[PDB]
């Protein structure tokens, strides 16, 4: 039996002196980065007038000397009319044949309806916009840009499509490529490499998603080899033509985690391609990918360039990013490394293509910083900076500097003084972008320095994946290129020299004023929790010892009472990922015990409530403060106890930190001596989120004023015990928090004691229902139902259009599917791919999954941890079976035999061909696939709705129009567009859904703490400019029937309700993220009196519901002559099961009316009901009898805005 964490995450090799120096500079301040970078570039006086008077004559020749402009300029095309042409012309392109294509454009196109000759136009309209506009519109909007090419077509005939046509095809073929393959790439250089230049090819590839597309790219690279050493001819490394590869194309698993497979499986491959260019003598580049891959990166450079069958060859090169902290610390790494292996490692400096995409990450993990820049004149000071390095070590390395930047070049060609001679260093630029600067540079009557371009080759499809990242990296506002075209900028301006104006800043190196840390990502409101770098080395040599250390702790779960801890039955807890790991033990209670332990909660309640709420507040920041503290020792017991991988034991520690401030925070908003407390809430949760969704119930219940009877799955008491026991450390007494371990008998002894005042609920439908049963002949003290918020299962699905990026796709869905071995309520459960692209996405999909590493967590290399128990692991496998018994196609990662110690259920998927093949939630790794045509969409959306869930729902689509009906259409509490469904953030994606998945209100939003109080406060933001029409139509009415008082307390409750909130919530760069407030549904009145039936009426209505009235109460004579608006949402319902589904329902009535009808109403079929009830007496007293809170629907959206290959609102911040 292996020991606890003993291989958790050793690094490839000992971290050696210059390393270690590496990872330190990771993630430090701005502040201290930029000083040492400002020493470093700093020239003489002589030098830097020298330098901007090159500058200058360069950028004159620039500005001194496009085809998409004349285009737009010629036909008088707006914006959008570019954008559609440019569209039809790459479809017209996919027509192989040109007399075909020109048949087509001549006969069909050109005449009228383009639409039924021509998977929408507008899949690469975001593309194409930047080109048109020089601006990034992530998704696009398909119906102007079809009414765009409507009118242009109508408006200019063939013509136009022609030369839109020709100029798609020159830009396509000669312009973002080369050449469509290496031979047609060659057969172009030789103009430019007569006048000096030289190349190095780029064949597009990167981000292999499975073994085979790793497996294609491989023999890409190496046919690519062949060719441009066959035309290299002998020239050698410097003259001649070199390739360029990105180490995440050769492999579908390249990082950190997977660091093993990388050195076992990707370097090899490394070593074949090096291996065929040495034997031709041409270069060979790895280019810089995300800053997660740098340090792994430099794994493969020292092995390779220590390899004595690579030995005699100088062509091994590689890229540094000027833009990360790290770069002066790799190029001392790489310089040394040359020494040692005696190879002149070629060095391309750049200043790095992913900034945006950094910047978001850091912000989504919670990291101390940025491993970039985040002011643009820091990277060119940098990148000056490590020019000077580079200089000084021509005899050891190879500089190649990669820029278009006019004063950079400059800055460096009288940096590197008069001495040159080809093979001391060289600049480089991209094709078709850098050719205007380098013509002014090479030959021996410009400056006489050599410049290798940068040669994309590929076919249309190959160079649109990832063409708006290419577009961005000279196209946002602060980029040369842009700046030089714009006339409002100086050449003044241009040639400023960077290292000078950052010496002369008040703060040198202060980090952007207007880019967030992600501790601050919330501003004032509260502190972001902090997460941990897992490509870290340090971090993980720390993580590894308090990670062992963690499991040599003897945890202990018991009753813990007011009065102390209780004896009960004690029992071991075992690892469900090796049964024969002991990770602790658990006293579980007693029904008596549990009994006692709510009546010490009743006699404890106002010594609670009489803590003001700033000071419960307290206790819930310095538990918070406690959790983030105890990070690396809570993340071992969740790895081991609840079978979770470290990432995502990390996010569940920071969203138990999450719900700690943001509870507090809510409650410092809202919370004052009239919102008083409930009682004694019980608190039951489940095993899957054992501390977060544990912690988020209790803080809520506690914050609010009530003392908490907790009551954890019987599957993870002792991460609950350590909850309660940081909670209790930070101020919570113990008589306001008891810890009840044991299974569903404790939690069924403490819902049904008499003191218990409140339940939260989060687990399965069907106990839920149990739950709902009990508490339905019950009232409080003061004769209104228990309030009970139930949060349950999910069917989710996501839907796949024939627009979206099929690796983009793949990466969510697995994620989805198959992360915690889908043991997330927000699991993705169908994945629905329209038919066009279904079998694609599906090879994909299977190809990934079998990409995946199941086992024991505690390895940073597992994927996918184990299920939590033997009976859960039956229960999915006996799905699977009869899945598979019905002949649907199965596919299964085999399990490796150290999984039989433990409880795992391989990662799974089946097709279906019906959404109905489902009936309930599978609560494991199965992902179900289903296929639509595009036109049975909103059948689709039907189909999912019909399962009666409605969790979390996603949207992969770049088209405005299927985003609009989709959204519009689906019913689901959390949205995901163009990103994943799981890990919603608490207070950015509040969490919960409707119908069967849930009550709400949602944790993790602003409604939930006033479920916990008798009197709800107005939460923060709440409210709405927008009253329902309906609700004014019923206002009217009662005014006509002369019912003066209702028709006032109608207009009321419209102006009261919050329908129509529509907010943005903070949260992390390149994301929206929405909170909305819709209607229920239909929500079933039961009344007693005329007036009492026209105030719930009236609170309804004016929160956008329909209704359906109780029959037997009589009063249908007291609706005659509804206005046929006010009709329309009026039913009259005698058998109340039968015209359900419906989504909550309003009673009025005495005690025992409310008892019966509260019974009768549980036992409706389907979703639980959100249930108010008032007398007669309290609807005349109290205007708030009916609180409008409950009778709206909260729907979060999160839209991923840099899913189009960058962010848009981040091009204008350097
Ligand atoms: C031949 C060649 C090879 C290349 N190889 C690679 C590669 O392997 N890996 C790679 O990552 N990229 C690569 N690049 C791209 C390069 O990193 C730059 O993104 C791009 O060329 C623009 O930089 P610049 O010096 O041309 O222009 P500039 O306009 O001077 O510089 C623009 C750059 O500034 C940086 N920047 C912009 N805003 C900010 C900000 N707010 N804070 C901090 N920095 C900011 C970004 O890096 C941006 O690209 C290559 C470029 C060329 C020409
Ligand atoms: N909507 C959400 O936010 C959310 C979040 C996480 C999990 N879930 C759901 O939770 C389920 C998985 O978690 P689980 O297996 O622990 O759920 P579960 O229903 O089996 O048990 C949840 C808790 O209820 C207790 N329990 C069982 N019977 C009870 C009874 N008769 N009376 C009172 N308590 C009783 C259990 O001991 C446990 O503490 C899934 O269906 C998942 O979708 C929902
Ligand atoms: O996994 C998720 O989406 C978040 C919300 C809740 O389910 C607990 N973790
Ligand atoms: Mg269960």
Redesign the pocket.
């Known amino acids: 039996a292996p020991a606890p964490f003993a291989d958790f995450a050793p690094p490839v090799r000992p971290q050696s002196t210059l390393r270690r120096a590496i990872t330190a500079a990771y993630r430090r301040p701005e502040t201290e980065c930029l000083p040492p970078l400002v020493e470093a570039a700093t020239q003489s006086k002589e030098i830097r007038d020298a330098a901007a008077s090159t500058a200058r004559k360069l950028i004159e020749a620039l500005r001194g000397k496009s085809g998409v402009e004349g285009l737009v300029q010629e036909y008088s095309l707006s914006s959008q009319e570019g954008v559609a042409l440019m569209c039809l012309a790459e479809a017209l392109l996919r027509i192989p044949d040109t007399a075909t294509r020109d048949a087509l454009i001549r006969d069909k196109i050109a005449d009228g309806n383009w639409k039924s000759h021509l998977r929408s136009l507008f899949v690469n309209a975001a593309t194409w916009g930047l080109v048109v506009t020089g601006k990034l519109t992530s998704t696009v909007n398909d119906r102007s840009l079809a009414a765009a090419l409507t009118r242009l077509i109508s408006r200019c005939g063939e013509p136009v499509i022609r030369r839109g046509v020709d100029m798609a095809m020159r830009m396509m073929g000669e312009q973002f490529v080369t050449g469509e393959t290496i031979r047609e790439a060659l057969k172009r250089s030789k103009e430019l490499e007569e006048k000096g230049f030289s190349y190095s090819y780029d064949m597009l590839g990167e981000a292999a998603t499975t073994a085979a597309d790793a497996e294609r790219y491989y023999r890409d690279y190496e046919s690519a080899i062949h060719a441009i050493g066959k035309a290299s001819a002998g020239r050698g490394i410097y003259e001649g033509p070199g390739i360029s590869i990105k180490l995440s194309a050769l492999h579908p698993r390249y990082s950190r985690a997977q660091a093993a497979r990388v050195m076992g499986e990707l370097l090899p491959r490394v070593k074949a391609l090096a291996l065929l260019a040495k034997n031709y003598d041409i270069g060979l580049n790895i280019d810089a990918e995300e800053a997660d891959r740098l340090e792994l990166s430099l794994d493969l450079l020292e092995v390779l360039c220590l390899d004595g069958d690579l030995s005699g060859w100088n062509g091994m090169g590689f890229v540094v990013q000027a833009y990360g902290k790290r770069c002066p610390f790799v190029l001392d790494f790489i310089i040394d490394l040359a020494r040692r292996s005696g190879r002149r490692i070629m060095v391309r400096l750049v200043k790095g293509a992913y900034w945006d995409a950094e910047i978001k990450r850091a912000q989504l993990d919670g990291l101390a910083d940025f491993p970039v820049f985040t002011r643009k004149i820091h990277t060119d000071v940098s990148y000056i900076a490590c020019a000077a390095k580079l200089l000084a070590a021509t005899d050891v390395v190879f500089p190649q500097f990669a820029t278009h930047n006019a004063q950079t070049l400059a800055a460096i060609y009288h940096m590197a003084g008069k001495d040159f001679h080809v093979g001391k260093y060289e600049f480089q630029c991209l094709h078709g972008m850098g050719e205007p600067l380098y013509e002014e540079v090479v030959g021996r009557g410009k400056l006489d320095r050599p410049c290798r371009i940068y040669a994309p080759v590929g076919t249309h499809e190959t160079l649109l994946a990832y063409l708006v990242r290419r577009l961005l990296e000279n196209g946002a506002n602060s980029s040369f290129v842009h700046r030089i075209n714009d006339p409002k900028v100086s050449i003044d301006e241009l040639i400023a020299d960077p290292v000078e104006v950052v010496r002369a800043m008040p703060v040198v190196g202060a980090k952007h004023d207007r880019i967030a840390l992600p501790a601050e990502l919330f501003g004032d409101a509260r502190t972001n929790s902090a997460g941990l770098d897992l490509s870290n080395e340090e971090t993980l040599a720390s993580l590894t010892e308090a990670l062992r250390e963690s499991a040599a702790m003897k945890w202990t779960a018991l009753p813990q009472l007011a009065t102390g801890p209780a004896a009960g039955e004690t029992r071991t807890v075992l690892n469900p990922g090796d049964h024969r790991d002991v990770v602790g033990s658990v006293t579980e209670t007693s029904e008596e015990d549990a009994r006692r332990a709510v009546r010490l909660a009743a006699d404890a309640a106002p010594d609670w409530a009489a803590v003001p709420p700033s000071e419960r507040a307290a206790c819930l920041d310095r538990a918070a403060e406690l959790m983030q503290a105890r990070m690396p020792t809570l993340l071992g017991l969740i790895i081991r106890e609840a079978g979770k991988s470290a990432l995502n034991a990390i996010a569940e520690v920071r969203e138990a930190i999450d719900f700690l401030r943001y509870y507090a925070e809510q409650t410092r908003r809202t919370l004052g001596p009239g919102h008083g407390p409930l009682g004694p809430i019980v608190c039951?949760?489940?095993?899957?989120?054992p501390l977060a969704?544990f912690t988020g119930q209790i803080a809520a219940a506690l914050v609010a004023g009530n003392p908490v009877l907790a009551?954890?799955?019987?599957?993870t008491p002792l991460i609950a015990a350590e909850g309660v026991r940081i909670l209790r450390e930070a101020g919570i007494p113990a008589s306001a928090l008891q810890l009840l371990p044991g299974?569903?008998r404790?939690?069924?002894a403490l819902?049904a004691a008499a003191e218990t005042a409140g339940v939260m609920?989060?687990?399965?439908?069907?106990?839920a229902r149990?739950?709902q049963a009990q508490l339905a002949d019950r009232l409080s003290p003061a004769g209104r139902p228990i309030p009970l918020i139930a949060?349950?299962?999910?069917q989710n699905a996501m839907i796949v259009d024939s627009s979206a990026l099929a690796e983009q796709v793949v990466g969510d869905v697995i994620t989805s599917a198959f992360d915690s071995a889908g043991q997330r309520?927000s699991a993705l459960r169908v994945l629905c791919l329209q038919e066009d692209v279904a079998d694609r996405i599906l090879t994909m999909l299977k190809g990934a999954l079998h990409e995946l590493h199941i086992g024991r967590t505690d390895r940073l290399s597992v994927d996918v941890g184990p299920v939590i128990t033997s009976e859960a692991k039956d229960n999915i496998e006996k799905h699977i079976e009869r899945m598979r018994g019905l002949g649907r196609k199965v596919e299964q990662i085999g399990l490796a035999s150290e999984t039989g110690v433990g409880t795992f259920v391989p990662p799974t998927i089946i097709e279906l061909e019906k959404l109905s093949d489902l009936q309930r939630?599978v609560?494991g790794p199965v992902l179900h696939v289903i296929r639509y045509r595009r036109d049975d969409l909103d059948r689709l959306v039907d189909d999912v709705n019909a399962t009666g869930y409605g969790?979390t729902f996603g949207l992969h689509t770049r088209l405005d129009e299927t985003i609009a009906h989709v959204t519009s259409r689906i019913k689901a509490g959390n949205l995901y567009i163009n990103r994943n469904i799981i890990g919603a953030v608490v207070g950015v994606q509040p969490?919960?859904?409707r119908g069967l998945?849930?009550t709400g209100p949602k944790?993790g939003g602003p409604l939930y703490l006033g479920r916990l109080v008798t009197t709800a406060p107005v939460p923060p933001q709440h409210s709405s400019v927008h009253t329902d029409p309906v609700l004014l139509d019923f206002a009217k009415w009662l005014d006509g029937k002369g019912a003066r008082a209702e028709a006032e307390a109608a207009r009321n409750a419209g102006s009261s309700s919050a329908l129509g909130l529509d907010l943005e919530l903070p949260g992390p760069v390149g994301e929206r993220n929405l909170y909305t407030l819709h209607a229920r549904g239909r929500i079933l009145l039961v009344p007693a009196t005329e007036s009492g039936l026209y105030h719930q009426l009236a609170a309804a209505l004016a929160t956008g519901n329909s209704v359906a009235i109780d029959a037997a109460s009589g009063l249908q004579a007291s609706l005659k002559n509804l206005p046929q608006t006010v009709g329309l949402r009026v039913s009259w319902s005698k058998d109340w099961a039968a015209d359900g589904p419906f989504a909550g329902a309003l009673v009025e009535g005495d005690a025992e009316r409310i008892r019966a009808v509260n019974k009768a109403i549980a036992a409706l079929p389907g979703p639980l009901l959100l249930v108010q009830a008032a007398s007669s007496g309290e609807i005349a007293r109290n205007p708030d009898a009916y609180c409008l809170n409950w009778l709206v629907e909260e729907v979060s959206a999160s839209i991923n805005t840099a899913a189009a290959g960058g962010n848009a609102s981040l091009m204008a911040i350097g």
């Open positions: 039951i949760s489940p095993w899957n989120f969704i009551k954890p799955a019987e599957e299974d569903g404790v939690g069924a819902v609920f989060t687990g399965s439908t069907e106990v149990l739950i949060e349950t299962g999910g309520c939630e609560f969790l969490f919960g859904g998945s849930g944790a």
